[PDB]
Amino acid sequence: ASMEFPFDVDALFPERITVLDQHLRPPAARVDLQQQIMTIIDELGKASAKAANLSAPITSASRMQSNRHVVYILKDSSAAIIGFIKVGYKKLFVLDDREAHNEVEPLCILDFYIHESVQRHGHGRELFQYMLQKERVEPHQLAIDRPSQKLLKFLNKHYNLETTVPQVNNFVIFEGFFAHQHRP
Amino acid sequence: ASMEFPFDVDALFPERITVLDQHLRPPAPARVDLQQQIMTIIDELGKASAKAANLSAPITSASRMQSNRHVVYILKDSSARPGKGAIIGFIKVGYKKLFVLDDREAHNEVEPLCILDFYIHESVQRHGHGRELFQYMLQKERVEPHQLAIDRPSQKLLKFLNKHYNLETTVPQVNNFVIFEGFF
Numbered sequence: 001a002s003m004e005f006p007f008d009v010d011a012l013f014p015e016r017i018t019v020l021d022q023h024l025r026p027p028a029a030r031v032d033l034q035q036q037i038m039t040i041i042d043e044l045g046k047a048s049a050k051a052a053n054l055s056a057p058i059t060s061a062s063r064m065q066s067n068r069h070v071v072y073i074l075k076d077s078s079a080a081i082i083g084f085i086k087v088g089y090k091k092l093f094v095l096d097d098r099e100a101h102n103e104v105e106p107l108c109i110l111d112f113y114i115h116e117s118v119q120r121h122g123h124g125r126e127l128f129q130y131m132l133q134k135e136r137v138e139p140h141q142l143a144i145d146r147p148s149q150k151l152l153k154f155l156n157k158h159y160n161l162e163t164t165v166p167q168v169n170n171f172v173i174f175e176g177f178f179a180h181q182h183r184p
Numbered sequence: 185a186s187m188e189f190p191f192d193v194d195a196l197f198p199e200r201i202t203v204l205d206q207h208l209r210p211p212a213p214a215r216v217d218l219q220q221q222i223m224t225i226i227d228e229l230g231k232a233s234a235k236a237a238n239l240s241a242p243i244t245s246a247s248r249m250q251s252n253r254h255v256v257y258i259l260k261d262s263s264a265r266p267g268k269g270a271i272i273g274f275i276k277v278g279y280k281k282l283f284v285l286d287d288r289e290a291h292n293e294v295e296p297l298c299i300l301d302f303y304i305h306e307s308v309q310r311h312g313h314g315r316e317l318f319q320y321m322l323q324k325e326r327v328e329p330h331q332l333a334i335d336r337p338s339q340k341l342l343k344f345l346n347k348h349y350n351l352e353t354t355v356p357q358v359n360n361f362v363i364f365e366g367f368f
């Protein structure tokens with residue numbers, strides 16, 4: 001039904017979408033609340049890894065505390081958690097079809113999960129659209145870290161994103177990423 | 185929910201679990217028309233299963249079925265609630281000649297029943313459907329769980345096999361199939 005936790009998620013996350021950074025700050029004891037948030041991030045990371053068939057999580061409280069990632073968490077309004085998306089700027093070398101490496105630092109989509117029970121009901125788009133508005137980035141400016149097959153379809157459906165230059169580094173970028181690509 | 189199709193699934197598959205092989209025989213319109221419906225169902229299930237396990241391509245399809253010794257057990261929705269019927273998921277199995285290391289790393293030529301592909305629609309995962317389907321297959325195949333080899337098990341599947349059949353400790357292999365203590 002969702003990710004259920006043995007504590008008052010509503011009290012902790014009063015908003016439907018909660019944005020947290022490396023500080024994992026409780027929305028306005030400090031210690032007990034913050035521990036609850038770390039548990040949520042740990043469990044979300046595990047669930048996302050099971051979903052994408054990863055042998056280990058790529059998102060955790062520990063990894064959040066030591067990076068400059070931003071996580072957007074979607075709460076179930078029916079007290080449980082429905083899913084999240086994690087983003088961050090990363091220094092990448094991107095190939096440009098003259099086959100040269102270009103050092104860039106785009107916003108990257110790093111991890112993304114919606115509970116199986118409510119996948120394909122528009123919640124992924126809900127979070128993605130919120131993140132786009134908050135980060136003030138256009139979808140074609142993004143790089144995606146190891147997109148899943150579901151995510152590739154999602155990006156093409158909602159944002160008309162079509163891959164551009166194939167990459168060797170497991171990031172994916174789309175038409176519009178390069179300066180000469182700006183068709184409306 | 186479930187997987188829906190532009191034809192009457194309940195008429196095509198009268199039974200809760202339908203077992204099909206390379207012949208793609210309609211269960212007890214024209215014959216070829218019903219076979220086309222079956223092929224469509226197998227193709228679509230294969231694609232869904234690949235998306236579910238984050239595979240870059242389907243490992244199950246009508247054409248692949250027709251040219252192999254694989255057997256598919258397809259579970260239809262039997263709910264009293266949902267008008268053309270719906271498919272919940274499937275499991276595909278086949279005997280394969282394998283060379284498996286035992287617990288002394290000695291090589292053993294075996295031909296176990298292998299679990300090759302397995303998928304339950306996301307909307308109803310974790311509701312016991314996979315267990316029902318797995319158990320039906322074991323009974324019809326007359327195989328015990330520890331006697332199975334698993335092709336490239338996903339993380340969800342490893343948890344599933346431990347929970348339901350107490351299959352947890354593996355005997356390490358060099359070849360991407362997985363077997364459990366007790367196989368020998």
Ligand SMILES: CC(=O)SCCNC(=O)CCNC(=O)[C@H](O)C(C)(C)COP(=O)(O)OP(=O)(O)OC[C@H]1O[C@@H](n2cnc3c(N)ncnc32)[C@H](O)[C@@H]1OP(=O)(O)O
Nearest residue numbers: 051111112113114119120121122123124125148153154157
């Ligand atoms: C960089 C990364 O994070 S890679 C990891 C991405 N995460 C995963 O793959 C985990 C499993 N999947 C999920 O958690 C979700 O499906 C997400 C996050 C990929 C998408 O969120 P949803 O809530 O499922 O998407 P939403 O309902 O908003 O959009 C639906 C669209 O996504 C795509 N999509 C979602 N599920 C599927 C599916 N099972 N098969 C194919 N495409 C799918 C389709 O384009 C679909 O549109 P359609 O129904 O018209 O075909």
Ligand SMILES: CC(=O)SCCNC(=O)CCNC(=O)[C@H](O)C(C)(C)COP(=O)(O)OP(=O)(O)OC[C@H]1O[C@@H](n2cnc3c(N)ncnc32)[C@H](O)[C@@H]1OP(=O)(O)O
Nearest residue numbers: 050236301302303304309310311312314315338343344347
């Ligand atoms: C050889 C191959 O086929 S590898 C590919 C296997 N297929 C996939 O990974 C595709 C996606 N997953 C699925 O289609 C299904 O989850 C299956 C086929 C693995 C299992 O079917 P379900 O109908 O989900 O199983 P069922 O409800 O019968 O059993 C539940 C158990 O499976 C495991 N399981 C199911 N979903 C999850 C999950 N999201 N995270 C961790 N474990 C899970 C758990 O052990 C769970 O028991 P629990 O709820 O007490 O923890």
Ligand code: NA
Nearest residue numbers: 051052116306
């Ligand atoms: Na999933």
Ligand code: NA
Nearest residue numbers: 116236237306
């Ligand atoms: Na899945």
